[PDB]
Amino acid sequence: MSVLVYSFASFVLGWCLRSGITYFTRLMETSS
Amino acid sequence: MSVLVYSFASFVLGWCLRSGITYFTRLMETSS
Amino acid sequence: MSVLVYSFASFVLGWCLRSGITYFTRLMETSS
Amino acid sequence: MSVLVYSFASFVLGWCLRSGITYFTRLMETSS
Amino acid sequence: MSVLVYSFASFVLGWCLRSGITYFTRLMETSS
Amino acid sequence: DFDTIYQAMIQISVVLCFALGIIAGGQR
Amino acid sequence: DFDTIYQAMIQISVVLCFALGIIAGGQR
Amino acid sequence: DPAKAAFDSLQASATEMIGYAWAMVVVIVGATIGIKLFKKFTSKAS
Amino acid sequence: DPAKAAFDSLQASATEMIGYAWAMVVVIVGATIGIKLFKKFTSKAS
Amino acid sequence: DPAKAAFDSLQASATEMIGYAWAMVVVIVGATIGIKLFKKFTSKAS
Amino acid sequence: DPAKAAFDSLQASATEMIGYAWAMVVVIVGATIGIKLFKKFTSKAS
Amino acid sequence: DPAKAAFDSLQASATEMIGYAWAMVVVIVGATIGIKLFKKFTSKAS
Amino acid sequence: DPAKAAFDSLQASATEMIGYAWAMVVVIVGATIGIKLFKKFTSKAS
Amino acid sequence: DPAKAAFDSLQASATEMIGYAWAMVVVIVGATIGIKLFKKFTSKAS
Amino acid sequence: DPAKAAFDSLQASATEMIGYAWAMVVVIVGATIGIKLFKKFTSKAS
Amino acid sequence: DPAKAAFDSLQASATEMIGYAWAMVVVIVGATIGIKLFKKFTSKAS
Amino acid sequence: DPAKAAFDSLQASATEMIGYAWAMVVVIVGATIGIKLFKKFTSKAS
Amino acid sequence: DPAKAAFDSLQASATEMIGYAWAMVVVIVGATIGIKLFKKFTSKAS
């Protein structure tokens, strides 16, 4: 089940990296 | 060209079923 | 038709898990 | 490179047909 | 690993070309 | 022939990753 | 050769699940 | 077409829904304007 | 045709899912619009 | 070419679908903008 | 169905959440209206 | 190009649509400003 | 079935990920709504 | 490499498409912002 | 897990960012309210 | 940290702008109150 | 990298665009504030 | 494993891309928030 494990791991990596930026933009807009 | 015909038919089915709900939500929000 | 059944089941699982969070955020924003 | 040419052509066809409607809705909302 | 390298390169090309337009629209709306 | 299939895969792949790139880019 | 096709599949898969991840992440 | 039947059902639902929305808006707006005029005329008369 | 069969099976599964989705939407939207009207009328009355 | 043939068939199906979509949009947007103007003019007149 | 169990849990969570939201709105709106009336009546009495 | 023809039709439609939008805005804004000035000058004259 | 096995393995991984996502959301939304209420009450009190 | 060749061909097609997109955007955004400023200045002058 | 490390870094960044946002809001709101009160009290005293 | 630097720069820019705003407000309010007192004292003296 | 060149062009375009936006905002805001002050001082002087 | 190797190579490429994205975001958001504050403080001071 190696394929599944490492393809799912690749989805979660992309979700984390981008959402980082989603939080920056949001926190900034509201604060100002 | 059976594959094409029946795969396109499957896209249009999903577009119709969901957009039904998009219209409900919209008409409701505006009316109220 | 096992493939179809279990792949569709996998779409509906992802729709449910995420929409849970969509409802939290919404209900919160409005209430406050 | 026929496959590439005709698959890209198929992306650009879908982009054009839909964006037509995006412009209608927008121009309407603003005008009114 | 040629396939991976050149397919990822193809994702980053599409991200750059479009976001160009996202910035135009944004900067314009705010300025006016 | 295996090689025909191979070439096709690569060609489709390149286009599909471009389209997902474009969609990612227009997210505000 | 079967093995060439096998490797290609894995490589394309990894990239396609990254792109869908990125799109999921920019949803407000 | 497999999809032709599907489209017809959408058309029908949309017609009915537009009908319901017009009914709701009338009631809400009636109330809003009613209260506004009450406040206005009471104060001018006093 | 193998593909006609495929589409036919899909239709059944999709019909059930659309049924569940309609149930959820009703409850959430009920609450949303309820709170909206509460906020509106309270402020106009005050 | 097998792929030229594929694209040609797709074009036909897509043209029909775009036709249905234009019909839906007209009806929904008619209603939306109608309600918007009603709300606006009622308030200005009051 | 593999998905049937999943849908039931969503239903349950949504019910509870609607409950919590109603509690919060009451408290916030209470405060808002309270302050508004205080400002109004104090000035008219003076 | 298969797509060249498609792009030209989009260009044409957009030009016409911009034309229609300018016509609508003029009529709505005319009314809005008209009513505003009526209310203003009537009250100052009285 | 090879496909039943596949879905079963997926469920486990998905459950963990949903757990992490709930943790993040709580912290971010806490802050967002906190700042919103601060801005609101400060202005009403002034 | 077959894949290097693939990417090289894609780049050419993408460059043309980006060219068409820039042309469309200019016209639409021109109109949008035009109408926005019209509405703004008319109201301030009145 | 390959992804466990990734999640931890997100958690850390979010904590720090919430910290910075609170600092900015205080400064902006300070200014806004300050100016408001200045305008108010100066006019009442005159 | 790329984000820490960003927040720091923003806060600095905002501090300068608050400085300029205070300068403008003083001049406008000076004039307003000046004219008010002129009108008042002239009439009481005469 | 195939993509390195692409990123550099984006950077350059963004710098120039920020430049243009600052120019537009100054002109619009100049007008807005100008009209506001005109209306204010004319009425106080009368 | 061929798939472990695949994921390892992906991680490297993704790290570089995230680096470029952070650089862009900083510049754009700087400008956006700058213009927002300018508009706000100018109006309060006037």
Residue numbers in the entry:
A (entry chain GGG), B (entry chain III), C (entry chain HHH), D (entry chain JJJ), E (entry chain FFF): 1 to 32
F (entry chain AAA), G (entry chain BBB): 6 to 33
H (entry chain SSS), I (entry chain NNN), J (entry chain OOO), K (entry chain RRR), L (entry chain TTT), M (entry chain MMM), ...: 5 to 50
Anything the authors wrote about it?
Most extensively studied in this group are the F-specific filamentous phages (Ffs) that include viruses f1, fd and M13. The tips of the filament are formed of the minor capsid proteins which occur in pairs. pIII and pVI form the leading end of the infecting phage, which interacts with the host receptors to initiate entry, whereas pVII and pIX form the trailing end11,12.
They both lack a signal sequence, form a single α-helix, and are present at the tip in 5 copies each. The terminus of the round end of the phage is comprised of the N-terminus of pVII, which is mostly negatively charged. In layer 1, 10 helices of alternating pIX and pVIII line the outside of the pVII bundle. Interactions are mainly hydrophobic, with salt bridges between pIX and pVII subunits, and hydrogen bonds between pIX and pVIII subunits, adding further stability to the tip structure.
